Amino acid sequence: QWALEDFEIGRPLGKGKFGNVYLAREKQSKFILALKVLFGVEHQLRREVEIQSHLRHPNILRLYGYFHDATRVYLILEYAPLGTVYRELQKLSKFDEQRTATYITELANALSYCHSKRVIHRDIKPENLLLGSAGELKIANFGWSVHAPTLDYLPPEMIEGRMHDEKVDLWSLGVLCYEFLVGKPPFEANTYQETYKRISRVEFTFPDFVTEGARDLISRLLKHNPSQRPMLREVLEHPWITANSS
Numbered sequence: 429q430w431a432l433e434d435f436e437i438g439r440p441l442g443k444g445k446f447g448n449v450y451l452a453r454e455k456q457s458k459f460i461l462a463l464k465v466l467f468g469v470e471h472q473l474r475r476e477v478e479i480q481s482h483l484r485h486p487n488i489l490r491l492y493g494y495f496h497d498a499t500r501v502y503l504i505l506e507y508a509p510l511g512t513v514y515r516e517l518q519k520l521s522k523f524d525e526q527r528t529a530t531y532i533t534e535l536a537n538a539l540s541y542c543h544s545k546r547v548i549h550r551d552i553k554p555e556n557l558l559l560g561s562a563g564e565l566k567i568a569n570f571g572w573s574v575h576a577p578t579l580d581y582l583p584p585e586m587i588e589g590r591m592h593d594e595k596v597d598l599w600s601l602g603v604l605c606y607e608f609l610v611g612k613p614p615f616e617a618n619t620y621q622e623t624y625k626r627i628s629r630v631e632f633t634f635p636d637f638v639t640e641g642a643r644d645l646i647s648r649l650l651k652h653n654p655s656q657r658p659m660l661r662e663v664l665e666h667p668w669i670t671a672n673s674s
């Protein structure tokens with residue numbers, strides 16, 4: 429289908445791994461979008477392209493198509509006007525309960541959908557969250573996404589090799605909810621090995637300003653045993669959530 433001859437490239441939106449992500453417009457349609465430029469994860473990419481392209485959800489970043497050349501490979505992606513949640517977090521330090529509960533909801537819904545098609549992200553972090561025109565949360569980057577059943581956002585069962593299910597994303601959902609309210613991940617350490625131990629033992633504490641309601645939800649999501657964690661349905665139906673979401 430597409431090719432570079434079809435696009436007028438704009439400013440860089442951000443830097444990534446294999447390459448940058450540029451703003452771009454499709455000459456013929458004048459349609460605005462983002463174009464990911466990438467020069468042995470090639471396999472996890474065929475799954476990224478495969479997985480995401482078929483995924484269609486308001487709170488998930490859309491992949492319109494792809495194309496490559498003798499040098500790099502381009503991913504034609506939906507453009508997110510308000511950038512990453514990561515940046516909004518560095519800019520605001522922390523989020524209020526209203527904002528956090530909303531992201532959690534939008535995120536839960538997108539994950540609920542994801543799990544129906546039997547897909548798990550396993551890489552849910554602020555850097556992989558974007559914001560639409562209305563400031564709605566949109567999940568991107570499925571490079572580490574699998575279809576079957578930094579450490580900061582990985583559950584105990586993953587860092588320890590064990591087989592995992594759709595439960596991983598609820599652990600990540602807890603870690604995320606905590607970072608939105610506090611400004612830093614629950615298990616943040618200065619080294620890989622320390623973080624590992626803290627995630628293994630599930631060692632986390634709350635700043636005083638973290639309300640009892642929020643502590644509950646987070647404490648429910650961060651259980652070492654996947655079986656104990658709530659399911660997305662229960663998450664939406666959390667008192668602290670419904671009292672702050674929208």
Ligand SMILES: Clc1cnc2c(Nc3ccc(N4CCOCC4)cc3)nc(-c3cccnc3)cn12
Binds near residue numbers: 442506511
């Ligand atoms: Cl994929 C994809 C689709 N849309 C985006 C997007 N959008 C975006 C819009 C606006 C602003 N602002 C920055 C200053 O304030 C004014 C505008 C930043 C990013 N960013 C990234 C990204 C961000 C960071 C690192 N690596 C990639 C990836 N994206």
